[PDB]
């Protein structure tokens, strides 16, 4: 914004042109490359923390009056699309 | 391995000249890292030593 530029940054003309060019250049290099296998990337990303999720699943086990399914069994039930939840 | 669940592998071997020494000319038969003590809380290793 104009007030932010002139009052907070105090950029000159050269620095302003440099910032605009750098912003455009760094944006144009962030698009995704055609050919990427995103399915296996997504599956690995979701299922790697699922391996470590077991350890801290039973923290809600520390509250006896909060016997609500969450963690490994809840993810299992979500994936199976079970028709009878606990 | 030691008797407190602290096991490892040999990573390099040095000769008596490159070994740090005390004022009495004693040399350690082996050297381990101290980054293994806190998270394992093996105070019995230190007491045994």
């Amino acid at each position: 914004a104009t007030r932010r530029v002139l009052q907070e940054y105090r950029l000159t003309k050269q620095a302003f042109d440099w910032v605009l060019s750098n912003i455009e250049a760094q944006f144009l290099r962030s698009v995704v490359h055609p050919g990427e296998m995103v399915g296996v990337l997504a599956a690995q990303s979701i299922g790697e923390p699922a391996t470590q999720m077991t350890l801290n699943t039973f923290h809600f086990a520390g509250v006896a009056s909060k016997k609500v399914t969450s963690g490994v069994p809840r993810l299992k039930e979500i994936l199976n699309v079970a028709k009878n939840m606990k | 391995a030691s008797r407190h669940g602290q096991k490892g592998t040999i990573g390099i071997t040095y000769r008596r000249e490159d070994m740090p020494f005390t004022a009495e000319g004693i040399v350690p038969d082996l050297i381990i890292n101290p980054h293994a003590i806190p998270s394992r809380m093996t105070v019995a290793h230190l007491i045994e030593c």
Partner: protein, 61 residues
Amino acid sequence: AKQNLYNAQGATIERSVTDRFTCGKCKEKKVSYYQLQTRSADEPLTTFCTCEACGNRWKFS
């Protein structure tokens, strides 16, 4: 009537109060904690901190 109105309430999960961790959302140090041996015993205990002022949650291990 008063007893029924009292008995219609839910379980209040009051957590331990402490003033050491700094929250990342509202930065109010009234952040509750809970710590346990849950990760593999090859590594130390795991703590989970939840801000009671805004609802932020995080983990330290």
